[PDB]
Design a binder for these strands. Sequence first.
DNA 1: AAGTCTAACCTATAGGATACTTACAGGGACACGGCGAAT
RNA 2: AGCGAG
DNA 3: ATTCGCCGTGTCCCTCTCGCTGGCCTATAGGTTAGACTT
Length: 1263
Amino acid sequence: NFFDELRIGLATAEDIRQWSYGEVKKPETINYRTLKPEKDGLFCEKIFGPTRDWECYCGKYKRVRFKGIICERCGVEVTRAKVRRERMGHIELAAPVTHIWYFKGVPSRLGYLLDLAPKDLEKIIYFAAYVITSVDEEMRHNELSTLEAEMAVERKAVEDQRDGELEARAQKLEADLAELEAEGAKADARRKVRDGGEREMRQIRDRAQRELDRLEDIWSTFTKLAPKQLIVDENLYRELVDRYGEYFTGAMGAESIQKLIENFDIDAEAESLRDVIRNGKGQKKLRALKRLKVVAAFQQSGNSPMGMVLDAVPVIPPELRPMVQLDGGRFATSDLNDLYRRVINRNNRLKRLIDLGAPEIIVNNEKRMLQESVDALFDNGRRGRPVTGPGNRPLKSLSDLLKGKQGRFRQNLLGKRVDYSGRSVIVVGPQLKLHQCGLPKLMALELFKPFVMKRLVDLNHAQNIKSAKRMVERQRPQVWDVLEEVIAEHPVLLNRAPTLHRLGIQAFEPMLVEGKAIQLHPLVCEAFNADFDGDQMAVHLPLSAEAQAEARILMLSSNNILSPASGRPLAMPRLDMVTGLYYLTTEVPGDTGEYQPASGDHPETGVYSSPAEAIMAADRGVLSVRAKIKVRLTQLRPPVEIEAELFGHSGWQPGDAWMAETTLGRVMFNELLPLGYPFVNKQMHKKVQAAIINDLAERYPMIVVAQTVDKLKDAGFYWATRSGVTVSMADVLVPPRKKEILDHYEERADKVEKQFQRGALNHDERNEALVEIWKEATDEVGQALREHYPDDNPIITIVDSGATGNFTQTRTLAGMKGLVTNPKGEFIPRPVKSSFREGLTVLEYFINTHGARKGLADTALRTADSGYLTRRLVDVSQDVIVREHDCQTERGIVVELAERAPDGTLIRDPYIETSAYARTLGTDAVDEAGNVIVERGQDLGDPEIDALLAAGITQVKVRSVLTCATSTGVCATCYGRSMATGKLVDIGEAVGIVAAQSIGEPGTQLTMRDITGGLPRVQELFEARVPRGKAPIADVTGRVRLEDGERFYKITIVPDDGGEEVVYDKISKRQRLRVFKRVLSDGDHVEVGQQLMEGSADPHEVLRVQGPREVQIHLVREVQEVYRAQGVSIHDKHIEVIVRQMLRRVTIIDSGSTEFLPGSLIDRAEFEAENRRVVAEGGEPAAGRPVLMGITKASLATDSWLSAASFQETTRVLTDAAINCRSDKLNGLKENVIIGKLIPAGTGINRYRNIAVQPTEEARAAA
DNA sequence: AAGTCTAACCTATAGGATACTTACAGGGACACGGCGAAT
RNA sequence: AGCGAG
DNA sequence: ATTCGCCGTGTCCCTCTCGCTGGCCTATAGGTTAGACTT
Ligand SMILES: [Zn+2]
Ligand SMILES: [Zn+2]
């Protein structure tokens, strides 16, 4: 494999016949009976190749020795049967045809190149109007006079005819008058002939005038006749040609367009376009820019446009165009055969017709047929009507195999079915270890079949590979002995679709299990989002030693305890385990065997010599595992204070002793944590366990953390059972004051309803009043309920301990359901007053159904919206790979980090764990000329945050991805800590995909609540769409004058400088202005960019008026606000990576002198390089401006056409790449994935991919 | 058993003469085109 | 065309 | 009436993944091809 470039471009007919191994003539596929491809047919062996390996049509050649020889009678080259898959055919068109893509795709590249228009082009090519290929006008000055004489002569003849007609009409009128006056009749009767003669002469002179005007019109057109015009009125074309056919050439159809392109200079058109843009303006300027792009695509490159009009069409080989019998031997081909056959039929008929010689009408018709058929072949449905086979189904065309999901790109390149794989339903495997997963032997046998045969053949269980195959297929007993051996230390990847985030795929060590279900360690469930209710999961087998190393090291379950999103652990006790630990470690005052300071009657009688004595006592009904006792701990480090006081500085604690007023349950728990962890002595509410595991991961090695979570799972499962947390109707206690307060609130509801009946307020007013009153009612009922429940209740125990569920669910269970959403989104003002325990009545259930159904449908659609957003984010930010240890730059954003309180205090800012942690300092922290507290270029973790807060400093400068000064991808330090590892990132981590996936996975959790505020808001922000309500923002400092205009608000910002008074008047009075320390108090000195009105701010205007730093900060701020409304913790640095990928192009206004379009987007790096280059050898430095692109446009406007082709708009991307003759460099993750070579991320980078290993000198010595 | 030697079969071409004349979502975005002031 | 998991 | 600047309307590519089940009529010359004897 030696790949470097895919330089797609226009394929001229010469190349088409160059590829072709032959030329299919007739539309004959397969013989009726012998089932053999015909000669010169669409499958002919001589053209494509032999359908059977080592054979030929007549069959006189069958041996392999004379390979590569073509027979005599039938002329079939003796090669492999598979060579048909590659050799390609072609067909010669009698008349040229136009490629559908360039002609019809909007904007019409053909029209832009030839200055013509879409409907006009449709008319000329499809034989509806004529076009002039060229005309030579230079020798027309004398010809002007000569033809003037000729036309004067014919006009004299026309006048002769006209006066003859007039004289004849006059004679007829005289005769009619003589005949009428010769007989007596009505006066009107005898003057009717006079009227008729008058009308007849009138219409005669009218016709003469009209034809004279037509002659004069065609004369004027001839005076100013030029090429590139549509001659509608075929009769006029016939007149023009049969009178002056010579010296000017006209044509119709694709041949006419080809002639027009031939007699045309690209350089002249390019120079004209340059001149117009040099002196143009307005929409004329924009059209000039677009057409200049189209033409300069050809001009700058060596690809001429003559390849757009096709003389020969290629034929995809046969095996990509199957023809196979099936079912009852019924042949079942594909649709391309019909399209190709139609093209062939049209072509043969056209050839014959031209040969025989037919009137231009029929040949034009046949050419039109061939044109529309080639269009359907290349792209069905793009023009005319979708050619529909039987059943009115649009036949698949060659283009269709690209677009959409079913196309090649998204279906068989970016994801493929794989061998050595399987799937099954999953079940909880609590006896498993974290790094283990079960495997039903009926599946492991089939997966490892390749291996078991080897290990048994070499064990002589069989005597050859085939015999071993028999043993496996027979499932003979010995296999289960060898299988159990060939499976050990052989990881397998467990996957669960959808693979929302990076943790979806995890490598486990498999162990044999009986049954039919993949046993899954429960801890990893949260990583997979799996719940054992019928979930199916897939097992994949990594074969190669490199792959097995990747499975063991990179992807093993125990090596991945922290979510890449924000570092929150995922393999931590959850749900059942949380309840078990909460029961184990809580402290109930009054349980059996308390520690009492008794005197006189007896000593304390609460102390215990060792936890051994404690467990022995607790085995009998003497002590409870949640009672306060004074134990003598001798194997656990005490808390910080006890150790620091008793032992002073360095008191080791594997063999010492100390008193602890704890609960035996807590001692049991703390024995689970490592030997070094200080005794915690608390109640393990879920947040506490999260903190414990996070501390362990940050400080302790990974193996210790994995073992600790394993033991925590064990203890939690063991103790949740004895916790007796069960649900029963006696354990769901209704509040006692329900009826009275409900009656009082209903009385208030009746009062407001009476007010409505008197017209005191409108129906919306009373609806709002009822909704608000009943919301107060729900608040009161919930408060009373939470008051009533004692902590020992199973439901409140489950909820309070953080095992699962929110409290509002318990309010519904025993309380009232509250308001119920009307399907539009409003609130049904009844509202439900019956608790699910008490049993809803019929109408209340029917009302609740609205909310349930709308929730389900919203989830169904939002899942797809989230998936699409994830795909777009992944495509924008795939190239962002950490590929340098250090920028060594000096820039970097700042962080608020606990700003001072108004009274004076370092109240911690709410957002630190998602915007301050895991960064590298761009500066050194000094307080009031104090000592340097923390040094530059060091990882910033929680101890440094506590140090900073203690110091008295809040503003901090931190290195960030936004200010990364690297060329290709971000550098390590500018990125900072990696969440999953907890250390500084490697120099191969594909952090872009991590950012995209961690930003996308929270999706399907943000419910929409006019300016959007849910997932669609995040979509708008990333896509950079203009917001709905454009709240105007200030442009300059100074006091502001505000007036409540007629249905709007007028605002004038006094510019501090001599700026123009920015005045805004067209604002809906409904929207309220921004509020601040006042609702834009008249005269406020809002800054040059403060949002004046309260609403949404366009990122484009913010960038324009404040700069890239501010727009980056604003985008990250808004996206974080949207994600945090639902309490999701995601570090910005992912969002900053996305924003960085959005802001990497600059729009230019000065052409410089190096092939730059004013207003074309170009990446910053090449922009600066071009500016530096052009500064040398004639200084015209192009001055550009930053632009904020949308994610989709950023994905499309890339340097590689493969990624853009596979992303979306495949036809447009391919046409553009063909015209520009672009060349992919195969330097992207997605690309190398398609062509199946190592991705330049992780282990595929040159540094790690080229490691060389040989044993050390001492190792060679030991041999 | 291919190499003749014998005897069919099958199919692209062609040919026959009343009369008959017009089938049968939605959203965003951009590009192709209405309405108005200026020269 | 129907269905399971999210 | 053309220029330039606005609006206005029409036509088109995109919105998650992974499983499973079933359901006319000849006439003729030339190409082509069946079977059989053999040394
Ligand atoms: Zn042959
Ligand atoms: Zn950097």
